[PDB]
Structure 1
């Protein structure tokens, strides 16, 4: 009864792996991170501003 139902679709299925929010999860080739968390890991991922 204390289990969360199994969802493959919708926001409740997708969660950011770092922060844990249920909101903005960019999935370009499988990142699983929130949109703002993406900035605190930008330069470790190899990304560079141009």
Structure 2
């Protein structure tokens, strides 16, 4: 007859499982969502671009 259809239909709309980062493609790190959409590993290198300062 014919080959089946299948499509992506997982409820990713809530939780950590909804999130993603544009800069490493994953969200397995501890993500930050307020402000920027990036993780903690993209804020070790990113942070002084955005005027975040190392000093205390």
Q: TM-score, normalised by structure 1?
A: 0.68
| Bigger fraction of residues in strand | 1
What is the DSSP-based 3-state SS (H/G/I as helix, E as strand, rest coil) of the residue aligned with 1:34? Answer: coil
- Give ranges in structure 2 of 5+ residues lacking alignment: 1-5
> Hey, what's the Cα distance between the residues in 2 that align with 1:21 and 1:32?
11
| Bigger fraction of residues in helix | 1
Structure possessing the higher relative contact order (Cα contacts under 8 Å, 6 or more residues apart): 1
> Hey, what's the Cα distance between the residues in 2 that align with 1:34 and 1:42?
11
**CA, structure 1 residues 3+37, in 2 after alignment: closer, same or farther (shift >3 Å)?**
same
**1:1-50 Cα distance to aligned partner (Å, 9 max, x none):** 33253522122210112011122354463311011111111110001112
Q: CA RMSD in A?
A: 2.0
- Give ranges in structure 1 of 5+ residues lacking alignment: none
Q: Report the count of equivalent residues.
A: 50
